Amino acid sequence: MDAELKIFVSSQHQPDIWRKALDQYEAKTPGVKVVIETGGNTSEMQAQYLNTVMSAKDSSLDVLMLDVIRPAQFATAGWTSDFSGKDLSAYLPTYAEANTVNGKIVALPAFADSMFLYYRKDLLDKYGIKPPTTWDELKEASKKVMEGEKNPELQGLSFQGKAIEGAVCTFLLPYWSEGKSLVENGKLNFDNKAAVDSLKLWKSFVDDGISKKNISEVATDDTRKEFQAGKVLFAVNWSYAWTHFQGKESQVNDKVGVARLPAVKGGEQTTCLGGWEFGVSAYSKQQDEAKKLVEYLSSQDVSKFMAINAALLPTYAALYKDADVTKTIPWFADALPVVETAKARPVTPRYNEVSETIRTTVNGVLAGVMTPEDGAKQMESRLRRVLRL
């Protein structure tokens, strides 16, 4: 009989392109069929679903696509089958480390990611503006362009203010730029002023009219779609957005530039480390076939295919200089130093509680139901119960 493998893929991760790679796998693997089980758009919705099926020890899923912040939970829970003993030296060290927990290899890298500043190069060029290196320059650039365009639909800055995993990244961008860390040598290190100032920064974009009043409703792919429609001057987003901006359903083909995120004044242009990996469910009754599929999907050939066809950043350093990759997406040639210096969200088996605390504080401030000052005190108090002190 055919082995019918089930692989969990987010609806936001371009399952139609993964399907092409899976079709190739089936064509070369007799007796194996793969079916995509669709996940929610954002990482924390995926986590709620996976917590439910893994807690029930449901055997139906075989391969799981997991966010870079998941390995500590999934390793300590015993929810994946480990690859320990495997040499990960072919992958970027960043992701070899992310997928190793207590020496146990919990998953194999799927693709890399980091946050970038997308900008409308046609608009900046019309107004004679260079890509901003600080959020303050970004504000001034937005005010000049918006006043000039007199376009009621043009947003200055789109970022993620919904209570989603991406809003954790939102909060940490200015915090890290100012040089602060949330976890220092394994212990919680919370800087109240920098936390308040991060929350105040995002709120100031809304208060000043540079971001729309309902940014508290905006998720990752909402930013993507609104910029793609031509309605946004500046967007914070991940690498996949590029393939959509240059695709057949775009209003901004050939009008998009990519830059590093702005810094706070006197800070560094830091960004958030993202990316995904493939795990074999510990409850799968297809352990052998599932492991073989993961080894294929995490191969250099598939990494190259997904970079070219889905703008997913590769997990192999050499692919950032591959002539086909850079012919398709020239700026990938400059992306590796951004990925390798991107800052990491906290590594903890209790990451879901950290995420829930931070993203709900961000969303509450942006929705106007909590002050930045109260938000930072609530965040610190709640994180002190979850993270080592």
Positions 47 through 106 that interact with ligand VCW (CB under 6 A):
67-68
Nearest approach in angstroms of CB 169 to ligand VCW is 7
Q: Which residue is nearest to ligand VCW (CB)?
A: 274
**Is residue 343 a contact point for ligand VCW (CB under 6 A)?**
no
> For ligand VCW, which is the closer residue by CB, 115 or 210?
115
Sequence letter at residue 354:
V
Burial class (CB in 10 A: 0-12, 13-18, 19+), 75: buried
> For ligand VCW, which is the closer residue by CB, 12 or 271?
12
**Is residue 238 a contact point for ligand VCW (CB under 6 A)?**
yes
CA distance 295 to 299: 6
SS3 state at 96: helix
**Is residue 357 a contact point for ligand VCW (CB under 6 A)?**
no
**Is residue 42 a contact point for ligand VCW (CB under 6 A)?**
yes
Pick the binder of ligand VCW from 109, 156, 166, 262 (CB under 6 A): 166
**Is residue 220 a contact point for ligand VCW (CB under 6 A)?**
yes
Q: Identify which range of 76-84, 164-172, 183-191, 246-254 contacts ligand VCW by CB under 6 A.
A: 164-172
Contact 68, 277 (CB under 8 A): yes
**Is residue 12 a contact point for ligand VCW (CB under 6 A)?**
yes
- What are the residues whose beta carbons fall under 8 Å from the beta carbon of 87, sequence distance 6 or more? none
Kindly state the tokens that stand for 24. Answer: 């190739």
> For ligand VCW, which is the closer residue by CB, 166 or 289?
166
Task: Label residues 112-142 b or e (16+ Cβ within 10 Å = b).
Answer: bbbbbbbbbbebbeeeebebbbbbebbbebb
**Is residue 13 a contact point for ligand VCW (CB under 6 A)?**
yes
Nearest approach in angstroms of CB 35 to ligand VCW is 21
DSSP run (H or E) holding 110: strand 108-114
Nearest approach in angstroms of CB 240 to ligand VCW is 4
- Number of residues written out for the chain: 389
> For ligand VCW, which is the closer residue by CB, 6 or 359?
359
**Is residue 109 a contact point for ligand VCW (CB under 6 A)?**
no
- Count the residues of the shown chain that bind ligand VCW, applying the rule CB under 6 A: 15
Pick the binder of ligand VCW from 240, 242, 278, 305 (CB under 6 A): 240
Q: Identify which range of 163-171, 226-234, 286-294, 299-307 contacts ligand VCW by CB under 6 A.
A: 163-171
Burial class (CB in 10 A: 0-12, 13-18, 19+), 330: exposed
Q: What share of the chain is helix, strand, coil (3-state, %, to 5)?
A: 45, 20, 35
Check residue 123 and give left, alpha or beta (phi > 0: left; psi -120 to 50: alpha): alpha
> For ligand VCW, which is the closer residue by CB, 72 or 124?
72
> For ligand VCW, which is the closer residue by CB, 174 or 274?
274
Kindly state the tokens that stand for 82. Answer: 């480990």
Beta bridge partner(s), residue 67: 276
> For ligand VCW, which is the closer residue by CB, 178 or 221?
221
Residues making contact with ligand VCW (CB under 6 A): 12-13, 42-43, 67-68, 113, 164-166, 220, 238, 240, 274-275
